[PDB]
Amino acid sequence: DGVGSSSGNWHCDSQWLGDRVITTSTRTWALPTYNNHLYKQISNSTSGGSSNDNAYFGYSTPWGYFDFNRFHCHFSPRDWQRLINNNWGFRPKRLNFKLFNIQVKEVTDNNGVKTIANNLTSTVQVFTDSDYQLPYVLGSAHEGCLPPFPADVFMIPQYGYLTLNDGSQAVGRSSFYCLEYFPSQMLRTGNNFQFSYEFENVPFHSSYAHSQSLDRLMNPLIDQYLYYLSKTINGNQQTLKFSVAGPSNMAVQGRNYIPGPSYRQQRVSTTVTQAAASEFAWPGASSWALNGRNSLMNPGPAMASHKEGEDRFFPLSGSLIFGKQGTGRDNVDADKVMITNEEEIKTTNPVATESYGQVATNHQSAQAQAQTGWVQNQGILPGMVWQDRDVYLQGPIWAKIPHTDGNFHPSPLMGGFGMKHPPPQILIKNTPVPADPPTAFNKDKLNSFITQYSTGQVSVEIEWELQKENSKRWNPEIQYTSNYYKSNNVEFAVNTEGVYSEPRPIGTRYLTRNL
Amino acid sequence: DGVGSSSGNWHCDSQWLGDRVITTSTRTWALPTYNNHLYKQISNSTSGGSSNDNAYFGYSTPWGYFDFNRFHCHFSPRDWQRLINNNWGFRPKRLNFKLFNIQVKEVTDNNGVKTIANNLTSTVQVFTDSDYQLPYVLGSAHEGCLPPFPADVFMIPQYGYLTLNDGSQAVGRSSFYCLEYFPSQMLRTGNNFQFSYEFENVPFHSSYAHSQSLDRLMNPLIDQYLYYLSKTINGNQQTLKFSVAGPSNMAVQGRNYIPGPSYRQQRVSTTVTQAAASEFAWPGASSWALNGRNSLMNPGPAMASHKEGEDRFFPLSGSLIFGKQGTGRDNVDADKVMITNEEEIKTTNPVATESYGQVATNHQSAQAQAQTGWVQNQGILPGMVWQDRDVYLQGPIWAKIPHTDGNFHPSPLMGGFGMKHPPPQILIKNTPVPADPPTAFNKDKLNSFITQYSTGQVSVEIEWELQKENSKRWNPEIQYTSNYYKSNNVEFAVNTEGVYSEPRPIGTRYLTRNL
Amino acid sequence: DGVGSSSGNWHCDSQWLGDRVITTSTRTWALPTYNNHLYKQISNSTSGGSSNDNAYFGYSTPWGYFDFNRFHCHFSPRDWQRLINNNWGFRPKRLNFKLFNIQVKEVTDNNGVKTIANNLTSTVQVFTDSDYQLPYVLGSAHEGCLPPFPADVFMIPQYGYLTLNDGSQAVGRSSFYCLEYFPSQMLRTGNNFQFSYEFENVPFHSSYAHSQSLDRLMNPLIDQYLYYLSKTINGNQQTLKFSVAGPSNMAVQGRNYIPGPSYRQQRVSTTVTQAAASEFAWPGASSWALNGRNSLMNPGPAMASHKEGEDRFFPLSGSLIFGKQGTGRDNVDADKVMITNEEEIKTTNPVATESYGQVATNHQSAQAQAQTGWVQNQGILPGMVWQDRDVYLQGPIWAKIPHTDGNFHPSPLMGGFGMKHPPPQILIKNTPVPADPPTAFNKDKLNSFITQYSTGQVSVEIEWELQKENSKRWNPEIQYTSNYYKSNNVEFAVNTEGVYSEPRPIGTRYLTRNL
């Protein structure tokens, strides 16, 4: 429109209908100039990397991008509490995104002092990768998302991508992408940008915990009409004896379904005053290999974090680890991080730090005793049932399913909704503004630009579909609740210095339903 | 429109339809003040020139101009690869040009420090020479075109022209052109400029290499019904003998068509550790004379660069020479330049460094032996066929056919499409903004102006018509392909410092068709 | 239709309308099995060739082809005489082609005796290269055309083609064509094949001889209003004198047009009892070079064979040479061949065995005498006029213009009509009939086939457009006529052994018109 007219209003609210909840969040953003308007080839050689497992090749772009792939970007703690305490499931339906109130500033430094002024004629470029023609980086748990607290002003993360690499070198199959080779809208201070997105059909997330275990689905009062081998020797003559499988021996009863797959993780205890044989963080970790590179199995298949009563143990890399407010980047203590756990899925999923089971490994005879072997990793078998990893308030929402010939249960392993066509990447960049050029023609590209940055507001609205609970359970359910006991600060609030903090990870599985 | 509203969006994409491909490219430009708003007479005396062959007379104008007469200004390397690997020919059809997001800046210097601010009321003037009333400088391979990389910001080249000269002096027939004597649109920051152009009908460029040679078009299994003189002496009595021309002697068979014209070039070898008799760059070069001035025959008629297996040789000035990224201007080594070759046209065109053939020079008799002479230059003859010079990704696209009474095959010798009415010149200039004038009237023209420069975006869209291939060839064709082998950088990409480079010239002739 | 019903009738006649003549010719053909149903790579190595100029690479196909690219295939001698004596020009208009009365025979050999029987169920495959996707071999004066005498039964020539070669080896750009990769009609004994073709617009062939010479177009009674330099020295003072160019000095008169191009040929005399300095057939011949291979300039540009009264001389390779009936293939005497001549075009074209003219080679002065040099080869110049090579009764009719970017006056140098889309190649092959296969499966391709050949009739009808003469010449014209004087045999008739012979080549240029 014009310089003196706002291009949008501040929309931040949650609307709770019967089977739907609509979340709207608005944030103020700041966008600097990245790479001084240049594309730069990057690799482990440029960053000084040495290990083969961490070698990479890619490019850093002068473009930023908007990321809102975390639940706290849309749900307040109270809204999250309502959702998890009142619904058996939820899933995103549609998306509305807006950019408005664009403000481009120029920075001039004379001597140790910088002056900031408006540049009303400068432009900011925004486009969406609706055709998914660029590498998708929103499927990784990267920082730079919209802040959970609406009053926080955030910096737009720089967009970068990786391609095929051989050490620090590239190959002929490696791809280079120029983001200026895409049509993009150019916005001055009076312009705004908006688009709508429809989520593809995804299953409802399981925001419930099973009230029954897979091995306890039988009637505890009635025998089965099936027999099991109860005795082999009479007291070395072979005397086979069979007995009815009933309530007194539930472990041997016939069952129609079995627990889901497993990929065993090393067990680590958080208890203080403990000794360790050696440094086993990398050496003792479960991993998978691709083209000679070892990658940590993290978080891996959805498995129960620990057995009943063993909350002190957690899988080495089988759980999401969040950092508390103010936590450092490198080598922080256990009390500075928040270790999530998936104990709710112990009713259907195997324990992460235990073998799946035992399998016969020979043919027993009068000369050879029957032998069994531990199954540390078990693939998918017919009749298996399992629960996917729970999602969290500060955890990811969705991920892009890789474009491959085949996949199985493409639920993101870090939690969330897997989609072939997720919300498109939204890329933003400040248009370069050259400084005064020389009065004589020079064919070289200009490298002198006016120092600029941009700021504005961003709004994203997502409609969520709800799956209401119809339980006939008589006794009250477990519910997420704040603790009344006095404390120096209110949980999920600001401190005396105005710092917002999330004191604990919040799952979604508090209500119960039968298996 | 207004100060705070963008006057255009960033359009940069390629759309591939069945028989048509539409290329759109957008770039950011910077325009300084040229000649301090003055017209200046220029000549070899003003530049210090001494040689008669390089003497000139002309004028330098305060106007800039937009040039997009190179293929890489519109085709990405991948689009170029698709075009050359999937089409037998192509030609431009229509043009769309846009100027928008005009930003005029003022520069003020206090003491060793410059401050840049917007001048919202200043104007930039743009007009197109649709009537071709000004000297056409886009027909020369000049620098200053739109960069191949969309992210590069480029400086608008200054417009200049030459007229008739006698040494460093002019004649009465010399013409002086004032570009302010043309109607031009004046644009503030809110205005935009656009026009459309239709290419005149031109033949499709030959993006194929012949799979047959002109001297091997006969049936290799059947004799001709024609005879040739096979013997003259019986072993000095004259005994004429005649024989059937057949597969065993293909060189003497009658043929309906002959190779095209030639203008022999000196042969230069790129092999290291070679000796030269003397400095023959100018003395040994082929040249043509006009009004007592010698001009290098460069690149001259389209001829085969070298014979089969002689890739080390190139004509002295018969091939286009491109410079690698970062190559200097004067006296660079051979490894700093890219020498193009036209070996694909060896099937119809004579070798550039060889004579066209031999012609009889006397009447043989019992006293005089038959004599022949080498034909170093051969003009057009009836029955001649030839292929024009190939075009390249970084090479020129079109040229203006000189307005003369007669011409023959007006295909530009540097490669491309010859047109009587090519895309018009687009001239741009910053309107002078006088400084504070004196409070007392002075009749002299003002010479104190506010230091200004302008910047903005430029978009050009060209629709290309495609000629699909309908070959019945069984074996696979030759195709342009990247090499998979590992390298420090990806070809046609940016370096670790963000520098875009084109590692090799890319022709168009990979597919094959019969002759 | 059926075995016992003819699929076509014998049509052989000429119909003379006012401005059109329709020629129909029917012949009986025989088609054997070529290459034993195989495709074979051929080269100068396979044929034992050694010279670089005769090196080639190509393939021989099991397919035959129909060729009617000679005038005597359609015109009887009487029809040719009428055409040449009554018309100033002619050109083909449309074509009708038919194959019918297919008869496939099987040959069985027991011991030194062969038995031939019908194979009613076998098929013959025919298709036309209407899209010109195969190498065109009809543009060379190859044998195997329809016989001039309707009663002669002819053998279908085998189809072969050449591709790019380096010595006896091929390159990646070389193409291999499989003719079974084309849709073709399969014909049993009851089936027939036919198609129609329309000739593209071509100029009328010049079947006239000019009654005026290019240097004698002025009025012999009136002076010009132009002056020429008549004297330089007064008897070494320079005294320029000028005179009117008039009838007394026609050589110095100004002229608007000049004779056509030239490429000088060595002069050879047919007179007996003559001595030669050395063997100059190849060494003294005019030639053109392509990719290091020398090809004889044959027949080269259309030039006058000899000066007036010098019929004994002929250019070394500038004239078509036909062989008399029964003439051998290698090293035959002059009386066994028929040397054509182009003396009719001496009025506009330069003599083949003479220089085009003289050109100044220096600047005359008081110290240096004026110097001139002979022009042995002269390219096209503005104002040039020329006549193309005459066509003959036994000579070629048309040729395919090579698909190239440029050509000049694409009239075939051997004579005839040049067309981008000439009559398509008609390819025919006997379908292989395997012998008894083994009773156990073998994956190798079958190599045991029933010996077969096919025979039938072929009819081609061509409509020719005529250009009637409207001369006002008073005296009778020169006409082609038979000689009444008694002879043992009638010219253009059969001998006592039934052998048909053509005793002389017949041109088309007997009538006259002004220049």
PDB file of N, CA, C and O in Angstrom, chain B residues 87-132:
ATOM      1  N   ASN B  87      17.448 -31.239 -29.110  1.00  0.00           N
ATOM      2  CA  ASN B  87      16.876 -30.487 -30.217  1.00  0.00           C
ATOM      3  C   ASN B  87      17.859 -30.383 -31.372  1.00  0.00           C
ATOM      4  O   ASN B  87      19.065 -30.227 -31.163  1.00  0.00           O
ATOM      5  N   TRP B  88      17.327 -30.470 -32.594  1.00  0.00           N
ATOM      6  CA  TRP B  88      18.123 -30.281 -33.799  1.00  0.00           C
ATOM      7  C   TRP B  88      18.288 -28.814 -34.175  1.00  0.00           C
ATOM      8  O   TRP B  88      19.152 -28.497 -35.000  1.00  0.00           O
ATOM      9  N   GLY B  89      17.495 -27.920 -33.597  1.00  0.00           N
ATOM     10  CA  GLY B  89      17.611 -26.509 -33.910  1.00  0.00           C
ATOM     11  C   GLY B  89      16.746 -25.670 -32.998  1.00  0.00           C
ATOM     12  O   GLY B  89      15.842 -26.176 -32.324  1.00  0.00           O
ATOM     13  N   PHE B  90      17.039 -24.372 -32.987  1.00  0.00           N
ATOM     14  CA  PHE B  90      16.285 -23.419 -32.183  1.00  0.00           C
ATOM     15  C   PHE B  90      16.482 -22.026 -32.760  1.00  0.00           C
ATOM     16  O   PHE B  90      17.435 -21.772 -33.502  1.00  0.00           O
ATOM     17  N   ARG B  91      15.566 -21.123 -32.405  1.00  0.00           N
ATOM     18  CA  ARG B  91      15.632 -19.738 -32.853  1.00  0.00           C
ATOM     19  C   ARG B  91      14.763 -18.889 -31.941  1.00  0.00           C
ATOM     20  O   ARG B  91      13.742 -19.374 -31.439  1.00  0.00           O
ATOM     21  N   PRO B  92      15.139 -17.635 -31.698  1.00  0.00           N
ATOM     22  CA  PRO B  92      14.285 -16.753 -30.896  1.00  0.00           C
ATOM     23  C   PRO B  92      13.023 -16.364 -31.649  1.00  0.00           C
ATOM     24  O   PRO B  92      13.013 -16.248 -32.878  1.00  0.00           O
ATOM     25  N   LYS B  93      11.944 -16.159 -30.893  1.00  0.00           N
ATOM     26  CA  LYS B  93      10.653 -15.795 -31.469  1.00  0.00           C
ATOM     27  C   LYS B  93      10.195 -14.409 -31.036  1.00  0.00           C
ATOM     28  O   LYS B  93       9.903 -13.567 -31.892  1.00  0.00           O
ATOM     29  N   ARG B  94      10.115 -14.143 -29.735  1.00  0.00           N
ATOM     30  CA  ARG B  94       9.624 -12.864 -29.240  1.00  0.00           C
ATOM     31  C   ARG B  94      10.332 -12.512 -27.941  1.00  0.00           C
ATOM     32  O   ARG B  94      10.965 -13.357 -27.302  1.00  0.00           O
ATOM     33  N   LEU B  95      10.218 -11.243 -27.558  1.00  0.00           N
ATOM     34  CA  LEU B  95      10.974 -10.697 -26.442  1.00  0.00           C
ATOM     35  C   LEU B  95      10.061  -9.864 -25.554  1.00  0.00           C
ATOM     36  O   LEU B  95       9.176  -9.159 -26.047  1.00  0.00           O
ATOM     37  N   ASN B  96      10.285  -9.957 -24.245  1.00  0.00           N
ATOM     38  CA  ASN B  96       9.640  -9.096 -23.263  1.00  0.00           C
ATOM     39  C   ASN B  96      10.713  -8.542 -22.339  1.00  0.00           C
ATOM     40  O   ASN B  96      11.532  -9.301 -21.812  1.00  0.00           O
ATOM     41  N   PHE B  97      10.707  -7.225 -22.142  1.00  0.00           N
ATOM     42  CA  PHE B  97      11.732  -6.535 -21.371  1.00  0.00           C
ATOM     43  C   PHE B  97      11.067  -5.643 -20.334  1.00  0.00           C
ATOM     44  O   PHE B  97      10.055  -4.999 -20.621  1.00  0.00           O
ATOM     45  N   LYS B  98      11.637  -5.608 -19.128  1.00  0.00           N
ATOM     46  CA  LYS B  98      11.065  -4.838 -18.032  1.00  0.00           C
ATOM     47  C   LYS B  98      12.160  -4.177 -17.208  1.00  0.00           C
ATOM     48  O   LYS B  98      13.200  -4.785 -16.933  1.00  0.00           O
ATOM     49  N   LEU B  99      11.914  -2.929 -16.814  1.00  0.00           N
ATOM     50  CA  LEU B  99      12.720  -2.220 -15.829  1.00  0.00           C
ATOM     51  C   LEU B  99      11.809  -1.794 -14.687  1.00  0.00           C
ATOM     52  O   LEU B  99      10.749  -1.207 -14.927  1.00  0.00           O
ATOM     53  N   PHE B 100      12.216  -2.087 -13.455  1.00  0.00           N
ATOM     54  CA  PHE B 100      11.360  -1.829 -12.305  1.00  0.00           C
ATOM     55  C   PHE B 100      12.217  -1.692 -11.056  1.00  0.00           C
ATOM     56  O   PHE B 100      13.426  -1.940 -11.077  1.00  0.00           O
ATOM     57  N   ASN B 101      11.564  -1.293  -9.964  1.00  0.00           N
ATOM     58  CA  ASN B 101      12.216  -1.078  -8.673  1.00  0.00           C
ATOM     59  C   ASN B 101      13.376  -0.093  -8.799  1.00  0.00           C
ATOM     60  O   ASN B 101      14.488  -0.334  -8.325  1.00  0.00           O
ATOM     61  N   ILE B 102      13.101   1.034  -9.455  1.00  0.00           N
ATOM     62  CA  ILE B 102      14.117   2.061  -9.648  1.00  0.00           C
ATOM     63  C   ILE B 102      14.469   2.682  -8.303  1.00  0.00           C
ATOM     64  O   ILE B 102      13.584   3.050  -7.519  1.00  0.00           O
ATOM     65  N   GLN B 103      15.767   2.792  -8.027  1.00  0.00           N
ATOM     66  CA  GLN B 103      16.268   3.399  -6.800  1.00  0.00           C
ATOM     67  C   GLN B 103      17.403   4.341  -7.164  1.00  0.00           C
ATOM     68  O   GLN B 103      18.451   3.894  -7.641  1.00  0.00           O
ATOM     69  N   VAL B 104      17.200   5.637  -6.940  1.00  0.00           N
ATOM     70  CA  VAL B 104      18.199   6.657  -7.238  1.00  0.00           C
ATOM     71  C   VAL B 104      18.806   7.132  -5.927  1.00  0.00           C
ATOM     72  O   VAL B 104      18.079   7.505  -4.998  1.00  0.00           O
ATOM     73  N   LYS B 105      20.132   7.119  -5.853  1.00  0.00           N
ATOM     74  CA  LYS B 105      20.864   7.465  -4.646  1.00  0.00           C
ATOM     75  C   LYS B 105      21.723   8.697  -4.890  1.00  0.00           C
ATOM     76  O   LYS B 105      22.213   8.922  -6.001  1.00  0.00           O
ATOM     77  N   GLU B 106      21.903   9.495  -3.842  1.00  0.00           N
ATOM     78  CA  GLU B 106      22.794  10.644  -3.868  1.00  0.00           C
ATOM     79  C   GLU B 106      23.973  10.389  -2.937  1.00  0.00           C
ATOM     80  O   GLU B 106      23.809   9.826  -1.851  1.00  0.00           O
ATOM     81  N   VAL B 107      25.162  10.799  -3.372  1.00  0.00           N
ATOM     82  CA  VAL B 107      26.398  10.567  -2.634  1.00  0.00           C
ATOM     83  C   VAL B 107      26.984  11.915  -2.241  1.00  0.00           C
ATOM     84  O   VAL B 107      27.179  12.787  -3.096  1.00  0.00           O
ATOM     85  N   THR B 108      27.261  12.083  -0.951  1.00  0.00           N
ATOM     86  CA  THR B 108      27.853  13.303  -0.420  1.00  0.00           C
ATOM     87  C   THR B 108      29.135  12.955   0.321  1.00  0.00           C
ATOM     88  O   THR B 108      29.146  12.045   1.157  1.00  0.00           O
ATOM     89  N   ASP B 109      30.206  13.682   0.016  1.00  0.00           N
ATOM     90  CA  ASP B 109      31.508  13.477   0.636  1.00  0.00           C
ATOM     91  C   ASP B 109      31.850  14.703   1.471  1.00  0.00           C
ATOM     92  O   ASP B 109      31.888  15.823   0.948  1.00  0.00           O
ATOM     93  N   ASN B 110      32.097  14.492   2.763  1.00  0.00           N
ATOM     94  CA  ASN B 110      32.469  15.583   3.659  1.00  0.00           C
ATOM     95  C   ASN B 110      33.986  15.696   3.786  1.00  0.00           C
ATOM     96  O   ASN B 110      34.573  16.711   3.397  1.00  0.00           O
ATOM     97  N   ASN B 111      34.630  14.658   4.324  1.00  0.00           N
ATOM     98  CA  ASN B 111      36.092  14.605   4.357  1.00  0.00           C
ATOM     99  C   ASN B 111      36.502  13.133   4.436  1.00  0.00           C
ATOM    100  O   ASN B 111      36.491  12.543   5.520  1.00  0.00           O
ATOM    101  N   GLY B 112      36.863  12.560   3.291  1.00  0.00           N
ATOM    102  CA  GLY B 112      37.311  11.181   3.234  1.00  0.00           C
ATOM    103  C   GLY B 112      36.252  10.153   3.588  1.00  0.00           C
ATOM    104  O   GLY B 112      36.561   8.966   3.735  1.00  0.00           O
ATOM    105  N   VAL B 113      35.003  10.590   3.727  1.00  0.00           N
ATOM    106  CA  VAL B 113      33.890   9.712   4.068  1.00  0.00           C
ATOM    107  C   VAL B 113      32.692  10.099   3.212  1.00  0.00           C
ATOM    108  O   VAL B 113      32.344  11.282   3.121  1.00  0.00           O
ATOM    109  N   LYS B 114      32.066   9.107   2.584  1.00  0.00           N
ATOM    110  CA  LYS B 114      30.925   9.327   1.709  1.00  0.00           C
ATOM    111  C   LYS B 114      29.652   8.806   2.366  1.00  0.00           C
ATOM    112  O   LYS B 114      29.647   7.729   2.971  1.00  0.00           O
ATOM    113  N   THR B 115      28.579   9.586   2.257  1.00  0.00           N
ATOM    114  CA  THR B 115      27.269   9.218   2.778  1.00  0.00           C
ATOM    115  C   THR B 115      26.305   9.060   1.613  1.00  0.00           C
ATOM    116  O   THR B 115      26.240   9.925   0.734  1.00  0.00           O
ATOM    117  N   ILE B 116      25.558   7.959   1.609  1.00  0.00           N
ATOM    118  CA  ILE B 116      24.627   7.630   0.534  1.00  0.00           C
ATOM    119  C   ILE B 116      23.211   7.699   1.085  1.00  0.00           C
ATOM    120  O   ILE B 116      22.911   7.091   2.121  1.00  0.00           O
ATOM    121  N   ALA B 117      22.345   8.435   0.394  1.00  0.00           N
ATOM    122  CA  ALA B 117      20.955   8.585   0.797  1.00  0.00           C
ATOM    123  C   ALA B 117      20.070   8.574  -0.441  1.00  0.00           C
ATOM    124  O   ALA B 117      20.523   8.840  -1.557  1.00  0.00           O
ATOM    125  N   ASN B 118      18.797   8.249  -0.230  1.00  0.00           N
ATOM    126  CA  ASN B 118      17.841   8.220  -1.327  1.00  0.00           C
ATOM    127  C   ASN B 118      17.489   9.630  -1.784  1.00  0.00           C
ATOM    128  O   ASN B 118      17.415  10.563  -0.977  1.00  0.00           O
ATOM    129  N   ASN B 119      17.272   9.780  -3.088  1.00  0.00           N
ATOM    130  CA  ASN B 119      16.744  11.005  -3.682  1.00  0.00           C
ATOM    131  C   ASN B 119      15.440  10.607  -4.369  1.00  0.00           C
ATOM    132  O   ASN B 119      15.426  10.261  -5.553  1.00  0.00           O
ATOM    133  N   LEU B 120      14.343  10.659  -3.612  1.00  0.00           N
ATOM    134  CA  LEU B 120      13.069  10.127  -4.082  1.00  0.00           C
ATOM    135  C   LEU B 120      12.506  10.893  -5.271  1.00  0.00           C
ATOM    136  O   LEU B 120      11.701  10.337  -6.025  1.00  0.00           O
ATOM    137  N   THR B 121      12.902  12.152  -5.457  1.00  0.00           N
ATOM    138  CA  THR B 121      12.345  12.985  -6.515  1.00  0.00           C
ATOM    139  C   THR B 121      13.154  12.951  -7.805  1.00  0.00           C
ATOM    140  O   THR B 121      12.714  13.533  -8.804  1.00  0.00           O
ATOM    141  N   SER B 122      14.309  12.296  -7.816  1.00  0.00           N
ATOM    142  CA  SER B 122      15.122  12.232  -9.019  1.00  0.00           C
ATOM    143  C   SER B 122      14.563  11.198  -9.993  1.00  0.00           C
ATOM    144  O   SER B 122      13.812  10.293  -9.619  1.00  0.00           O
ATOM    145  N   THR B 123      14.948  11.339 -11.260  1.00  0.00           N
ATOM    146  CA  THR B 123      14.397  10.530 -12.336  1.00  0.00           C
ATOM    147  C   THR B 123      15.505   9.848 -13.127  1.00  0.00           C
ATOM    148  O   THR B 123      16.647  10.314 -13.165  1.00  0.00           O
ATOM    149  N   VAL B 124      15.147   8.733 -13.758  1.00  0.00           N
ATOM    150  CA  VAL B 124      16.011   8.016 -14.686  1.00  0.00           C
ATOM    151  C   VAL B 124      15.283   7.911 -16.018  1.00  0.00           C
ATOM    152  O   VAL B 124      14.084   7.612 -16.058  1.00  0.00           O
ATOM    153  N   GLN B 125      16.003   8.165 -17.109  1.00  0.00           N
ATOM    154  CA  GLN B 125      15.422   8.216 -18.442  1.00  0.00           C
ATOM    155  C   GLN B 125      15.791   6.962 -19.224  1.00  0.00           C
ATOM    156  O   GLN B 125      16.958   6.559 -19.254  1.00  0.00           O
ATOM    157  N   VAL B 126      14.790   6.351 -19.854  1.00  0.00           N
ATOM    158  CA  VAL B 126      14.968   5.131 -20.635  1.00  0.00           C
ATOM    159  C   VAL B 126      14.187   5.262 -21.936  1.00  0.00           C
ATOM    160  O   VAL B 126      13.043   5.729 -21.941  1.00  0.00           O
ATOM    161  N   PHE B 127      14.803   4.845 -23.042  1.00  0.00           N
ATOM    162  CA  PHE B 127      14.102   4.754 -24.314  1.00  0.00           C
ATOM    163  C   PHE B 127      14.751   3.665 -25.157  1.00  0.00           C
ATOM    164  O   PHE B 127      15.898   3.275 -24.930  1.00  0.00           O
ATOM    165  N   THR B 128      13.996   3.177 -26.136  1.00  0.00           N
ATOM    166  CA  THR B 128      14.448   2.128 -27.039  1.00  0.00           C
ATOM    167  C   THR B 128      14.582   2.690 -28.447  1.00  0.00           C
ATOM    168  O   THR B 128      13.704   3.421 -28.914  1.00  0.00           O
ATOM    169  N   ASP B 129      15.682   2.345 -29.117  1.00  0.00           N
ATOM    170  CA  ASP B 129      15.910   2.751 -30.503  1.00  0.00           C
ATOM    171  C   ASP B 129      15.161   1.810 -31.453  1.00  0.00           C
ATOM    172  O   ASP B 129      15.745   1.043 -32.219  1.00  0.00           O
ATOM    173  N   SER B 130      13.829   1.882 -31.381  1.00  0.00           N
ATOM    174  CA  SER B 130      12.990   0.991 -32.173  1.00  0.00           C
ATOM    175  C   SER B 130      13.111   1.271 -33.666  1.00  0.00           C
ATOM    176  O   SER B 130      12.902   0.366 -34.482  1.00  0.00           O
ATOM    177  N   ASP B 131      13.441   2.504 -34.043  1.00  0.00           N
ATOM    178  CA  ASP B 131      13.604   2.866 -35.445  1.00  0.00           C
ATOM    179  C   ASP B 131      15.034   2.694 -35.939  1.00  0.00           C
ATOM    180  O   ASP B 131      15.306   2.983 -37.109  1.00  0.00           O
ATOM    181  N   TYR B 132      15.944   2.227 -35.080  1.00  0.00           N
ATOM    182  CA  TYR B 132      17.334   1.956 -35.448  1.00  0.00           C
ATOM    183  C   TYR B 132      18.005   3.197 -36.037  1.00  0.00           C
ATOM    184  O   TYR B 132      18.699   3.137 -37.053  1.00  0.00           O
TER     185      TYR B 132
END
